[PDB]
Design a protein around this ligand. Structure first.
Ligand code: NA
Ligand code: NA
Ligand SMILES: [Zn+2]
Ligand SMILES: [Zn+2]
Ligand SMILES: [Zn+2]
Ligand SMILES: [Zn+2]
Lengths: 292, 292
């Protein structure tokens, strides 16, 4: 059932596992994410970026998730606004029925970030909705994180410890500041969020290139860094790129191998399966499998 | 809003125009169809095959359409089960919120076709749902059609007048029996349905071939035959193949021109536009534009 984001992440926080936060932009992605959670007996964070919401319509985004929740009413599900850019955007998500909203003001100075975050928190908490904020761009200041969390009363925090959104994360070898993660965790004692957490698994890379795609030397967060992140206190692991590559790899493959194929189901049933499997493996990696 | 299929088709019947019946299998197809209906001020018949319902789940098929209707509440919309093959399938569609159901028993002899159709009609009319049936494979016997409609109470009839499904309709020159259509129309005085009515326009074919697609010498119903069909009494024009070809053309196109592209919206926003334009033009051709 559809629940406050903090309901899910407080449990992950206390028990020391990570919950994948999986972006979707249409029915096929959403269906595959839900089937993965059902098969791995794992809670789900479902997130939609502002762009995904513009594409679907916020009414469709919420509506499709509510249908999927009724289909799998035993799975805890949070519906999360990913990288909300304005108070008004977070407010619209709250009104539409999102159960978690992220406000990204990390590009502002501390005082302005804190002020905007606090305003979102007041609004969202009055409506029973949980709030994520971000600190750091470059890396988080743990004492700043400590005061930020206490002052804003935000539910979870994304501290910058060395990740970038999308492919092409690291200018070489993957590096994450785990001692800084541990300090943030110690001082804030709340669920923490990792952005830019796609790993680009080798099998997903191989299916994408074998289908003719070009990943342009992208580097994901290695699996061991994700596991060490969770050990350091990460409880929400934002995952988008991995899903998109796996999905479009299969779409490209169908197009290549049958130039007369125009039944959408023939493109998107294998795409769903590939996406579903990435999610299932990620739920096992992060420790959310069998936590229902 | 969401209305009984007969509400839309009775108006078309009485005023002598055709309403396109457009199949969907996911959100992108449904969104494009609805934007077309909104931009051409046209009533909408939205169709889901049994395969599409299995792919989406009938709860999602109905759910997404209801969301779309609330987004465009000035548009009359019927949600129609396309080629229901059993009573139980039609009954499940009625229970899920479909407003029109088609039972295809045209492969049975007249007596068994009529018996199953009448059983579906009694169930669906008790629930306020309209019913379509089919006669002919062999082209329709107009005198059978007259008795069939009188005895079954079915709301609209698909008579076989020379069309098959999907691509590869005519292995030569297009040809439809308009004399037999006019007779069926005169004897039944109900809305009539044309199955296998995709035209495969030249521009859609070209886009698909331009993107490396292979249409294997497929040929559709020419626009002038579709217009002569509506002149003869066709009021519902089943359209599916044209939508898929135009959609997948743009998908293949995006895959070909950028091997690093894996943002789903970059594949499906141009796909939606190409599908919307096919639908808009078809609505103009059939005479449903500006009938809202
Ligand atoms: Na987020
Ligand atoms: Na039909
Ligand atoms: Zn992010
Ligand atoms: Zn971020
Ligand atoms: Zn048909
Ligand atoms: Zn048929």
């Amino acid at each position: 059932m559809l629940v406050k984001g903090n309901e899910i992440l407080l449990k992950a926080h206390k028990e020391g596992y990570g919950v994948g936060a999986f972006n979707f932009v249409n029915f096929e992605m959403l269906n595959a994410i839900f089937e993965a959670g059902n098969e791995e007996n794992s809670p789900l964070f479902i997130q939609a970026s502002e762009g995904a919401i513009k594409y679907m319509g916020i009414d469709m985004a919420v509506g499709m998730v509510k249908i999927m929740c009724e289909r799998y009413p035993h799975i805890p599900v949070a519906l999360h606004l990913d990288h909300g850019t304005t108070f008004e955007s977070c407010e619209k998500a709250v009104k539409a029925g999102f159960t978690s909203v992220m406000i990204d003001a990390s590009h502002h100075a501390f005082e302005e970030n804190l002020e905007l975050t606090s305003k979102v928190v007041k609004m969202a908490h009055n409506a029973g909705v949980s709030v994520e904020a971000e600190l750091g761009r470059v890396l988080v200041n743990p004492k700043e994180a400590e005061q930020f969390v206490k002052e804003s009363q935000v539910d979870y925090l994304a501290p910058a410890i060395g990740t970038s959104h999308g492919a092409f994360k690291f200018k070489g070898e993957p590096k994450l500041d785990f001692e800084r993660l541990q300090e943030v965790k110690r001082l804030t004692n709340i669920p923490l969020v990792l952005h830019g957490a796609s790993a680009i698994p080798d099998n997903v890379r191989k299916s994408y290139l074998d289908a003719g795609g070009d990943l342009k030397g992208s580097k994901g967060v290695p699996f061991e860094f994700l596991q060490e992140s969770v050990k350091g206190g990460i409880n929400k692991v934002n995952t988008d790129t991995d899903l998109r590559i796996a999905f479009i790899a299969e779409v490209r493959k169908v197009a290549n191998e049958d130039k007369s194929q125009f039944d959408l189901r023939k493109f998107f049933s294998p795409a769903q399966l590939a996406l579903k499997n990435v999610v299932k493996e990620r739920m096992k990696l992060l420790g959310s499998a069998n936590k229902i």
